[PDB]
């Protein structure tokens, strides 16, 4: 009935000053701002949800216009609660500074 996922901001790709690697995204999870509270989110599934013009299939329901890109959180990123994520398809860079859902059911609790 409510939200069963955490909010994350797509900060950007894994990049240096003049080179970027689009296969590894950076996720800023709300509520964690240190590399001690990020142990819970390691290995968690993540989804980028976006709606498009043409209708697509939808499990357990009628076809909808919404689509998602799935991914997995690999490890934390530099003492500030940032985490690294790897998606099956690289993020389109349109989602820079946009919301993604960190699911809670690779549970290890």
């Amino acid at each position: 009935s409510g939200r069963l996922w955490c909010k994350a901001i797509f900060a950007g790709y894994k990049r240096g000053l003049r080179n970027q690697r689009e296969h590894t995204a950076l996720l800023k999870i709300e509520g964690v701002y240190a590399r001690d509270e990020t142990e819970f989110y390691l290995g968690k599934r993540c989804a980028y949800v976006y709606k498009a013009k043409n209708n697509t299939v939808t499990p357990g329901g009628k076809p909808n216009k919404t689509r998602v890109i799935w991914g997995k959180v690999t490890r934390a990123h530099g003492n500030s609660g940032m985490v690294r994520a790897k998606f099956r398809s690289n993020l389109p860079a349109k989602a820079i500074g946009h919301r993604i859902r960190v699911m809670l059911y690779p549970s290890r609790i």
């Binding site: 009935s1 069963l4 955490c6 990020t38 989110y41 699911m103 809670l104 059911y105 549970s107 609790i109």
Partner: protein, 145 residues
Amino acid sequence: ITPGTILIILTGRHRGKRVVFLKQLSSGLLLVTGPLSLNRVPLRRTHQKFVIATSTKIDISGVKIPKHLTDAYFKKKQLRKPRHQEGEIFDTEKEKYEITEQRKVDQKAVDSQILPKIKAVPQLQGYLRSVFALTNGVYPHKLVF
């Protein structure tokens, strides 16, 4: 995860519901029961990776779970091949899944023992009837369950 503990189911249609863990089947799936009167979750199978184990346990040692129900009992059998397969026929119809009254009697037998124990603890029935969700200012890494 211990028998008699309370779990939160996160992936199924019973999203965020709270259930009672009874036993682990041969296949490794957890047998889950959220009282039909309270949680509307019958004898079902869940997965450990898709379950949150809360820190709430009831004394479940004094119950007799039926032996016959098992992983083979919790299985699907429909969608047979040899029929016509051409047109607007061949298993797109029948629109339903039967309730299998043996399932009803098993649920009654399990609930007759589950309900008195969970009603001994105050507010436990209400807690089970409530569902889990995330609100503003609450973080899973912060709060402990």
